[PDB]
Design an enzyme around this catalytic site. Sequence first.
Site, PDB file in Angstrom:
ATOM      1  N   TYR G  23       0.843  -1.440  -0.444  1.00 53.24           N
ATOM      2  CA  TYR G  23       0.061  -0.307   0.005  1.00 53.24           C
ATOM      3  C   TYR G  23       1.057   1.281   0.097  1.00 53.24           C
ATOM      4  O   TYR G  23       0.333   2.555  -0.321  1.00 53.24           O
ATOM      5  CB  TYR G  23      -0.656   0.126   1.161  1.00 53.24           C
ATOM      6  CG  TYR G  23      -1.518  -1.111   1.012  1.00 53.24           C
ATOM      7  CD1 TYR G  23      -2.604  -1.544  -0.324  1.00 53.24           C
ATOM      8  CD2 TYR G  23      -1.876  -2.232   2.471  1.00 53.24           C
ATOM      9  CE1 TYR G  23      -3.509  -2.873   0.246  1.00 53.24           C
ATOM     10  CE2 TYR G  23      -2.816  -3.177   2.453  1.00 53.24           C
ATOM     11  CZ  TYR G  23      -3.388  -4.016   0.801  1.00 53.24           C
ATOM     12  OH  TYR G  23      -4.373  -4.942   1.252  1.00 53.24           O
ATOM     13  N   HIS G 100      -9.018   1.066  -5.656  1.00 55.86           N
ATOM     14  CA  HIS G 100      -7.627   0.035  -4.889  1.00 55.86           C
ATOM     15  C   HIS G 100      -6.677   0.267  -5.073  1.00 55.86           C
ATOM     16  O   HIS G 100      -6.156   0.763  -6.494  1.00 55.86           O
ATOM     17  CB  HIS G 100      -8.522  -1.474  -5.043  1.00 55.86           C
ATOM     18  CG  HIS G 100      -9.579  -1.682  -5.254  1.00 55.86           C
ATOM     19  ND1 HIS G 100      -9.643  -2.534  -3.777  1.00 55.86           N
ATOM     20  CD2 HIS G 100     -10.632  -2.026  -5.771  1.00 55.86           C
ATOM     21  CE1 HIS G 100     -10.713  -3.069  -3.763  1.00 55.86           C
ATOM     22  NE2 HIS G 100     -11.268  -2.656  -4.367  1.00 55.86           N
TER      23      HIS G 100
HETATM   24  O1  LIG Z   1      -6.594  -0.282  -1.001  1.00 52.25           O
HETATM   25  C1  LIG Z   1      -6.215  -1.333  -1.823  1.00 52.25           C
HETATM   26  O2  LIG Z   1      -6.281  -2.279  -2.591  1.00 52.25           O
HETATM   27  C2  LIG Z   1      -7.325  -2.626  -0.356  1.00 52.25           C
HETATM   28  C3  LIG Z   1      -7.583  -2.352   0.314  1.00 52.25           C
HETATM   29  C4  LIG Z   1      -7.654  -3.352   1.150  1.00 52.25           C
HETATM   30  O3  LIG Z   1      -7.921  -3.153   2.572  1.00 52.25           O
HETATM   31  C5  LIG Z   1      -7.525  -4.446   1.180  1.00 52.25           C
HETATM   32  O4  LIG Z   1      -8.789  -5.818   1.394  1.00 52.25           O
HETATM   33  C6  LIG Z   1      -8.266  -4.867  -0.543  1.00 52.25           C
HETATM   34  O5  LIG Z   1      -8.509  -5.947  -1.206  1.00 52.25           O
HETATM   35  C7  LIG Z   1      -7.292  -4.481  -1.022  1.00 52.25           C
END
Ligand SMILES: O=C(O)C1=CC(=O)[C@@H](O)[C@H](O)C1
Lengths: 135, 136, 136, 137, 138, 135, 142, 139, 135, 142, 135, 138
Positions: G23, G100
């Site tokens: 992330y 995401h």
């Molecule tokens: O920021 C993201 O792409 C993600 C955050 C999450 O909390 C995950 O559950 C998600 O599958 C992907």
Amino acid sequence: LIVNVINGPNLGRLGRGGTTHDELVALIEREAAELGLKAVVRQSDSEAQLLDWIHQAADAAEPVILNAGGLTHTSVALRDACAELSAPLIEVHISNVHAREEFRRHSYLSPIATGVIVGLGIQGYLLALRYLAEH
Amino acid sequence: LIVNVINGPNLGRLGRYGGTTHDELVALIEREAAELGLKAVVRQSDSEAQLLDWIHQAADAAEPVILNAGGLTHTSVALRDACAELSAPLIEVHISNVHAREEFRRHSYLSPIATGVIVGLGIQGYLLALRYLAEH
Amino acid sequence: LIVNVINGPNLGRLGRGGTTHDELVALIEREAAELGLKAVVRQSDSEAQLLDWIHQAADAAEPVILNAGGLTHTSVALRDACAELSAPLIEVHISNVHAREEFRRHSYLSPIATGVIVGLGIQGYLLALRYLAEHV
Amino acid sequence: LIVNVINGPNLGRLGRREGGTTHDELVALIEREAAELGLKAVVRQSDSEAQLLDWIHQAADAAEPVILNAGGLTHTSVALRDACAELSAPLIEVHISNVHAREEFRRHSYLSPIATGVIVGLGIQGYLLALRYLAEH
Amino acid sequence: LIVNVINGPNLGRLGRREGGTTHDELVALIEREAAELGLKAVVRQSDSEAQLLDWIHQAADAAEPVILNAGGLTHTSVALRDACAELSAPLIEVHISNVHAREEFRRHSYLSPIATGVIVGLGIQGYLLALRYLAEHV
Amino acid sequence: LIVNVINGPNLGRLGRGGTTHDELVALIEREAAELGLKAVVRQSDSEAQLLDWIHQAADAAEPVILNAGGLTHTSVALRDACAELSAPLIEVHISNVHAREEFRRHSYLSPIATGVIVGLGIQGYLLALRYLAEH
Amino acid sequence: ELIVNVINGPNLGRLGRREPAVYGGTTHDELVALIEREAAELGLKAVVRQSDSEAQLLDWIHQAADAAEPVILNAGGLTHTSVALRDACAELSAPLIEVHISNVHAREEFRRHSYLSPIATGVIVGLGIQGYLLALRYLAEH
Amino acid sequence: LIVNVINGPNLGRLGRREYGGTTHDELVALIEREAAELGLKAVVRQSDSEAQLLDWIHQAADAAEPVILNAGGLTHTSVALRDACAELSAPLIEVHISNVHAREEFRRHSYLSPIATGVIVGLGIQGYLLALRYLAEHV
Amino acid sequence: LIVNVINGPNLGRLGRGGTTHDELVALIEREAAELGLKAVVRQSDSEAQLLDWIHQAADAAEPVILNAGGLTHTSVALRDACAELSAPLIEVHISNVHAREEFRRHSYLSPIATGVIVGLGIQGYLLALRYLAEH
Amino acid sequence: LIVNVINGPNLGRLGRREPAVYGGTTHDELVALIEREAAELGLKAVVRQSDSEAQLLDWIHQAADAAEPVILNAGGLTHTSVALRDACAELSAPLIEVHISNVHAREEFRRHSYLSPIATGVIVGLGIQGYLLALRYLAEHV
Amino acid sequence: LIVNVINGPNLGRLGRGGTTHDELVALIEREAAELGLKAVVRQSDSEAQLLDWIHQAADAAEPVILNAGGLTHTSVALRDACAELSAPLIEVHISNVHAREEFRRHSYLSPIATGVIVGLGIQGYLLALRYLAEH
Amino acid sequence: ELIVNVINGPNLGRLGRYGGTTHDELVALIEREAAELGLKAVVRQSDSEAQLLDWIHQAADAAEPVILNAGGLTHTSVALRDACAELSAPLIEVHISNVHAREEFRRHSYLSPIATGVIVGLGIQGYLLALRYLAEHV
Ligand SMILES: O=C(O)C1=CC(=O)[C@@H](O)[C@H](O)C1
Ligand SMILES: O=C(O)C1=CC(=O)[C@@H](O)[C@H](O)C1
Ligand SMILES: [Cl-]
Ligand SMILES: [Cl-]
Ligand SMILES: [Cl-]
Ligand SMILES: [Cl-]
Ligand SMILES: [Cl-]
Ligand SMILES: [Cl-]
Ligand SMILES: [Cl-]
Ligand SMILES: [Cl-]
Ligand SMILES: [Cl-]
Ligand SMILES: [Cl-]
Ligand SMILES: [Cl-]
Ligand SMILES: [Cl-]
């Protein structure tokens, strides 16, 4: 109170974690002494031999700690032998089986066992021994 | 050494099979922890958000977690993601043998990212998890 | 007898065929009164709140008319709480879930419910009340 | 205003098993409830699929509502679904037992997607609750 | 040369449910087309599975070609499939609507694997084209 | 007036039933003439060439009789091209595709085609032409 | 003059230290700062909010539906699990963009399904925290 | 001691394609002679009609008589037939002439097997007679 | 500096939104000029041609914006070619692929792509250009 | 005629093992019953039991070399062993599969057999009688 | 004695272990000469081109060693053309196709091929030649 | 010398009683072919899973290559896969018949993912070509 500790295929190959099967046998001996019970540790790569050992434990009404190795995921025969057990059966896996291949996340033994300990390493054996000592 | 025991939805309803209540469980865990030379903090919530908060706190404090997520075991990716932050060992506990029941209970989102899983050993599953953490 | 009518997530949003939840609450209350029952109608978007209302209904041994909404298809935790109920449990859906997406065709609540009413609009609540007036 | 109650295979066998109510008594229960609501109920049972299809064809031509308990045919018969697809008046599927608390194959219905509504697990009273809906709608 | 046109459940109700060609009009048009091709068409419809089974037994017993639209029984009936497997003369499966532009359960057929061929979605003309195939066949 | 007969991969290999592709073209043209239609019959193993032919039929608003061969079960690209067609589209297979392997029993073409003819041999093309003459 | 809602679900308040190889190292406060700046640059007003509670997220969606304001949604774990959240988002008349941070298709198989995707206007995946900024730019253009 | 032998769809067509030379008329006679030799009486009936099959099973349930059932294709498709058969308290034996497991996969599921006493598959027409012998040995 | 925009089968048919592929090329080249980049936009219905272009991008270490069309769901060959890329790869879809048929909800390109932009219309390309200009 | 009756894993435990499922008859008693039925039918029956896959394979091998029919109850191996199937496929003389319990009234994993497709016939859920019924079948076509 | 070695999509990209396609062609021709055979090694990223090469091998009744790349798992058309081959057909994969993604563990070519060699590197080709020399 | 273990699983002792070459003939055939390549082949066969596991363990301890035809255990044994996972020297999986032209259950292998390579359908020569791979990879 005699507890049967039964190890399946490839489990005699421990070390060769880094804890060998001989070392595991020694660790179980000392824990058995603390808990005030007798523990018999057996290992075989032979399915037939494991079936016979379960049969004896069924007739003797003795608790079983079982690490079936690869037979866990494949053997109905071993499951059916274990179904005769009236004393508790604890399934044991050294590694965390749910962090590996998907086919390892199914077990024929789990539904008919009292309980399952997974991924707590060699300690899984000693913890199963303690469960049986206090039950 | 501080160990967190976190119980999920419906676990506050214990013995209201079986007989042991949540308070009695708290007392047993605290008693066993004292014998092992550990300190145990036992919490229960039916709220996913509250569980996530306790996991985050354990991640920041690098404290071990014994987690019984109840029904969220099979459903919550969010709880799995929170537990993925933990650097200290995570042990998943179930009181009943989860494999002797419905097929949907035989899958867990938590198991793959947990250190270990104890299932079907009743309330003693918590105490055995405590002993593992005291030995590591 | 006291009858619990519990509505899950997104059901406080009824109207925006155009019956609002406030109108629904009043309509259920009036219908139950005519059948010699008292209807306690409550709604929440919080799973933890819904679980708490189920727990109380289990302790008081009171009938539950449940529309869990989206949680019908996803929550094992809600199923486990409903499993505690000794009195009849009736699942209600306003729309026909079988004429929509395929994921709506599974309910975790149905196998542990006494019965299920689907696709009969808001009158599904009223027909569920009439069952409880008879049984049992 | 007339409402058709149609029962499928094995439903003439009501009583021996388990509720403990016979099909004759069910006919009596529905008719007594229908008159009270200001409706007319025609209750018919057949083990023959071809007979159920014919009863549904006539119901579609007369534009009359149908309360249907197809029995085992709920899960197996596309033809019965195709016949019920003709209905312009409401169709309510009924199951006496909770179909979701049994075998998994019972948890799928060919009739449900094309029905107006479904009542399951409310016993014999399911039929009467279905009637009351039709008096309103 | 006799050709059996067998229609299953709900196909007597043609001229409703979907354009507006009745089953009587279907019989009449098939018989006109059969006469032009030098064939005799026996066209029959039933909502009863046992009756369809019997008609297929007759067609196997007499070694006669079959044009079959089984309706809903297409996707469900193993019995009908087993009956059709006994046929030594050609068998053409017919669907009036395009069965693949509808529900996914309609895209499987027990009859298709044991038929000579299958005609789908060409409307009521599917029957007529099936007759024409049988004029050169074998 | 104009009907496009488009054959996909391996359909130029007909013969080595017994009817070759050159003879099939001749059969189709003769049948089209008797019905008062003009048939343009083309064969390619290239997916890109097939899409191009379908693009032209979409622009010209002309009916298509399509035997895509193996691409029937695999090509979304071909399906999307056929989606542009406003005039009728007939999917044709020479053999009974349901009496063979299971992967042949799925078609990307069928849901968007007007109709499908299967297992009626080389005559499948001719019957498809006859449908279009009446529509 | 035009309000755009940026809604972050469970665990997204943990940005910075949570799985940094997946992330990144940017904090949620810094994310709030980045989004608000970019929105003003485009002539928009961004209201950025995060919650671990599904109920709170549902409420924010309802309010956005009543106000007819666009939503940029990163539901976190609830993306793959919540029919309740999907149903709330279905009320939205103004565009909904799913975001995401990580490439959700380069990880576990269960992350490759979304209950939100079919009802959203569009989806941005694997383009980091800039996915938010690019989602704002789409809304400023539409 | 009455034993009901019920044959479903297509079983009237026995010995028309070929293995299998014995007709249904002759099968009926074989079963009856074997039943008499075992001190039992067989009522052998065949119907292509599901409704008729259900009717015969209802009567068997009400009379508490054993059923030897070859349901043909309805084995794999009929929940109604399963439900009627579940009412039987006297032994129910599922019979298939050919080996059902050596053919198409869809023939390897039976709705009847779970609720039957036992199942005999692939032993030809002798399956019927062996099912009779099970009943005779449990009189 | 040099960003490759590659469009697969049927994408030359855009317009026939009413935005043509010629207009799309113009918009992309315009946006690239504003961001200080050069955009080479190419469309082909041939899988082989697309593979060739991917190879060239791999050898030149240039970023790729890819809309493979129907090949997204079907082509492993294209996946393996795109796997060679050392520079970022952005998968683009004009329509919301998840609001359509179920077979469209799987992509062989997604797992190996840097990112995926879905359902944002023609602007998806321009947003993908902006991401690359920031890296 | 010589017929081979072969019993797989756990079948030596008959009488004791889950009696409400398999019955109270011991394996020794089963041997005696089979020998009594064989003599009446004018056959010779050799009954053997092993918990070992290898020993069962060897018995199948011998039966293939001698062209003697086989009545097989493989126990748990029924649902698991391809190796046993491959041995049984070599048999030219008939093979009858026998299950004591009604395998379709139990767990779903028991409802599939690797042996059934290559067997001549299959008898399920008729108890100990299944073996005796298999004997008579082989006698009547010997 | 002519053997046709046909390489599919991405196989011209070998090297960029480190054995290139030219080196592969060289190694195959060395082995061909030593075995008293003539090897015709050809590569294309075009499905249609591969179809054409197997058509020629079908007509000439010459054996084929085929590495189809990603088309292995996707092309029914290639399977259909390979079905025409009267002479032996050996399927080759350089890498272990079963140690990678699950979609690679299915081949449309394996069922119709004589044999399959997988995971033995470049030598898989040479061992396939040696089989054909004894047949 | 350079030792290569050739291990045959259940039913492979029964070769030549579809094929023609017996197991004894195969052993001698492999040995001579190995010698011509400057290798020494130890060819062993067992129907016992425990025995195959034993031989695999010893091969892992000695770091010797293994050519394995596991018979039916290929599709069924996790135990064998786990033992084979210990091998550091190359492992070649062998099937005599084309395992992909038969039943579907034969198309999955527990061994393949952990093997160096897999040779299928090339008859008895599959063993010989496997030896030749190992001759180039010492
Ligand atoms: O920021 C993201 O792409 C993600 C955050 C999450 O909390 C995950 O559950 C998600 O599958 C992907
Ligand atoms: O005799 C039987 O029916 C059985 C014996 C066994 O040992 C079980 O593994 C098998 O599923 C059923
Ligand atoms: Cl299980
Ligand atoms: Cl998981
Ligand atoms: Cl459920
Ligand atoms: Cl449906
Ligand atoms: Cl089929
Ligand atoms: Cl499709
Ligand atoms: Cl969805
Ligand atoms: Cl079942
Ligand atoms: Cl993928
Ligand atoms: Cl099988
Ligand atoms: Cl295949
Ligand atoms: Cl695997």
